[PDB]
Design a binder for these strands. Sequence first.
DNA 1: TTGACTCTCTTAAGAGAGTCA
DNA 2: TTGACTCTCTTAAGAGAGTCA
Lengths: 162, 162
Amino acid sequence: ALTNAQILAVIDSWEETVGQFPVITHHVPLGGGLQGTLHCYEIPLAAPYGVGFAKNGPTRWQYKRTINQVVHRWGSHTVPFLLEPDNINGKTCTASHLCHNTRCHNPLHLCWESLDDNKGRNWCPGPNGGCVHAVVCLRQGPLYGPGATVAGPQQRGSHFVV
Amino acid sequence: ALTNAQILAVIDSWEETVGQFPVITHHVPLGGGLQGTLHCYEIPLAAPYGVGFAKNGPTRWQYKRTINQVVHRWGSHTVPFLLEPDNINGKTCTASHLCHNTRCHNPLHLCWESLDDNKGRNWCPGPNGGCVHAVVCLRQGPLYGPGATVAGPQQRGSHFVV
DNA sequence: TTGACTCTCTTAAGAGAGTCA
DNA sequence: TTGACTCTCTTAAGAGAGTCA
Ligand SMILES: [Mg+2]
Ligand code: NA
Ligand SMILES: [Zn+2]
Ligand SMILES: [Zn+2]
Ligand SMILES: [Zn+2]
Ligand SMILES: [Zn+2]
């Protein structure tokens, strides 16, 4: 809600509830042929999810609290960042999964950045493969690699140059 | 159905028309601190665009030809690939700008790949910076770099471990 | 046959808000 | 007050199809 105290109380209640989600260990590529281990705190697959939580889409949730007799609601991954600017360079700030695991709500696996920065981590080589993200990746992005391009650049005639 | 010869004729008329678009020289980052040059064949900002071309969105165009009294229409960047498979790994193939310049229709600046592969090139370090795309990038992606993350992973209590 | 407009849709990273019990 | 559902929207890489003269 409005006060900094009220916001801190929201963050603390969320952390306490998410802290009781099942902890699932995931072994992950780091880049450079190395592997690491992440501990994701995963929201349940079906109701009940935890105090204050409800599912608004297949992999979307919201956190809800009643403050001063008014309901306040947030996207379930945005709560750690309620004291942060909600935009950057005129772009909306988004909760970004460093673990690439939507159900995970571990705040040690989240950052707060533009949707472009968020998306781009899907192709990052990872913290041991050349990640240059200033807020470093926790793993190689799941889509990193050579790709599966069907056809490359080509012309039939002689009208074009690179 | 259009024959192979008729499809080749469509590609040839498309190349003839696009080859007469304004050719703009752009200096671009290649990665590794190196600079290169790309020559983009840019569709005009407003009508007329060229024979067969029309705008269906702010940065979307279509190519149209009428063959044996039947109107055929294609996305304006898809024409170089009409003789190629149109899906791979269960994913639709998309025209992918190696030059990251939407108005460009140079077929030497296009490839044909899944939408995920297409998007991922935005963050590639480039052909002189570590690109691993099997069909190699022509330049460093416009979004490559450290990013502008507003807040990193953090917790207030001690409920979580990474 | 052609040009210049019109409209909505796909994807996968993300959101906000209303209806009931 | 709290829970469990419902719906549509945003972005930036991409699409198909209709109307009129
Ligand atoms: Mg692209
Ligand atoms: Na993400
Ligand atoms: Zn996680
Ligand atoms: Zn990274
Ligand atoms: Zn180009
Ligand atoms: Zn590349």
